[PDB]
């Protein structure tokens, strides 16, 4: 994740061992339950795309869903590229180049951009646009996973 | 389970079943408004005859405590 | 929550997960037992209103009391607004907003915002006005919930 | 607690989660035996009277015994407000007033009141006044419920 | 369950029923003249027929730990 | 339970009754003059016939651990 320093300035610091076990934890013991998305929430609190692939990397276990979501991820990623055009002309050497889908998806950016986008002035808070996919993706399998 | 399919048992306490209403309702993501009106609908309807009845006594304007110490010995 | 840095400022830091995990375990343990209020108040130190609903949300179970007390803290919340009614003219530039009952609910208002208003001079406290409905609820639930 | 920070002032700290706990556990399963008393003595270090009445709150079970050390608290409490009568005319505005039983239970003091008269030049030992309160009901307890 | 069905069994030793009477009385909010007046009345009327004998025998002006130890063999 | 309530069986080992002594003593808070006068005294006092016999062949000035070898057999 990307956290305050002490110094008073914002850096990245990796996430910690029993955090990641709690995440294993708690899908293992809720699986599909609601709960499950406020727990996320908190757990991806100033969390990058980068850990988020993480995270769902790391799951072991109900691979229909999984699969689900991963094309709602796309979807919504498709939909992101859609919606926002590319910019007029070249990139000026001045300034850093706008995200696409895959970007906040966190495939086609790598961290030191993750970082870019999200600590630069203004900031760009692709982790809030991942984190709405992830939970109306959430929504979808509830609703399916409902009996 | 769909939320149509929950309904009080012929020996069940309410209570068991408004805690399975909830939670239902809790897996229901509809505006507020519409979940108000599954709220005053759905709960009494699906109620068992003998605390139905008993609701239909509180009259309208009856909040859940009332509700759930209302029908207690049912 | 909003907690004290060794600079000597009022900044925000995440709650912990095995603190989190404490209160999830109270809940499962003690149900709707006294000794739950106190506890609450402990691990509620310096907490936010996002932090509270956090905390209420998590919960598992016993469906019929969280209703019963979304509907105290609503009703609590439209009692706030009741009793303090919006102020004269438009806002200064200068200032910043008074809270409704639902920004003390954290509803409509966002982290910063609930930042602004703890931290800033006079400091206004959200926390202990949602807190006293939690804990009046909280009895409401204790006396309901004797056998 | 009120603790020492690196800076080398005297500055309050809340109580950790997994201490609390610990209280809890040893209740549990040691209830009313005497190694009880060593135990909250070293979990009591630097305790404040809100902090002890917040551990007394928190038990559950044993509410005759709990009642009974309540009982001892005010009587405790009554004999310091006989034994030390209130001081001569109005209180100074150079000077913070002296503590009632009340105070010293907690029950009439504000933390920052109890931070007060500890921190203070001369500093005043309030939690060493309730401790004792707390160790001679400790043994009424424990003399009583030796079978 | 209410204060008022808090009674003491007729094999039950005291000391378990004024367990279970302070912590239903944990549960009651009242103020404390109130509950003051709920100690010295309901515990004994509640009390049963053998140990209600006993603490009759102590007087009015008893503490708990003598009201305990009077009804130990009870 | 009393510490002159407190005695050796007939088949249990000394050391065990060691052990329930120091614990009830243990719950015992007079003067240390006065705790030395019970050890000497209600500990062989109350201790079994065949160890008693045992105990009095040890004679006075002896410690801890030469009773609880010296009791050890029976």
């Given at each position: 994740?990307?956290?305050?320093?002490?110094?008073?300035?914002?850096?990245?610091?990796?996430?910690?061992?029993?955090?990641?076990?709690?995440?294993?934890?708690?899908?293992?013991?809720?699986?599909?339950?609601?709960?499950?998305?406020?727990?996320?929430?908190?757990?991806?609190?100033?969390?990058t795309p980068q850990d988020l692939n993480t995270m769902l990397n790391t799951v072991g276990g109900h691979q229909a869903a999984m699969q689900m979501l991963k094309e709602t991820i796309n979807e919504e990623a498709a939909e992101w590229d859609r919606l926002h055009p590319v910019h007029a002309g070249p990139i000026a050497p001045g300034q850093m180049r706008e995200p696409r889908g895959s970007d906040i998806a966190g495939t086609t950016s790598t961290l030191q951009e993750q970082?870019?986008?999200?600590?630069?002035?203004?900031?760009?808070?692709?982790?809030?646009?991942?984190?709405?996919?992830?939970?109306?993706?959430?929504?979808?399998?509830?609703?399916?996973?409902?009996? | 389970t769909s939320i149509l399919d929950i309904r009080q048992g012929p020996k069940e306490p309410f209570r068991d079943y408004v805690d399975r209403f909830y939670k239902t309702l809790r897996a229901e993501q509809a505006s507020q408004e519409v979940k108000n009106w599954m709220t005053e609908t759905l709960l009494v309807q699906n109620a068992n005859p003998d605390c139905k009845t008993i609701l239909k006594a509180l009259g309208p304007g009856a909040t859940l405590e009332e509700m759930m110490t209302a029908c207690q010995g049912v």
């Open positions: 994740p990307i956290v305050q320093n002490l110094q008073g300035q914002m850096v990245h610091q990796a996430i910690s061992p029993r955090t990641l076990n709690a995440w294993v934890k708690v899908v293992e013991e809720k699986a599909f339950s609601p709960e499950v998305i406020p727990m996320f929430s908190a757990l991806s609190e100033g969390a970082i870019g986008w999200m600590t630069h002035n203004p900031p760009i808070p692709v982790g809030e646009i991942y984190k709405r996919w992830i939970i109306l993706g959430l929504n979808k399998i509830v609703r399916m996973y409902s009996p | -």
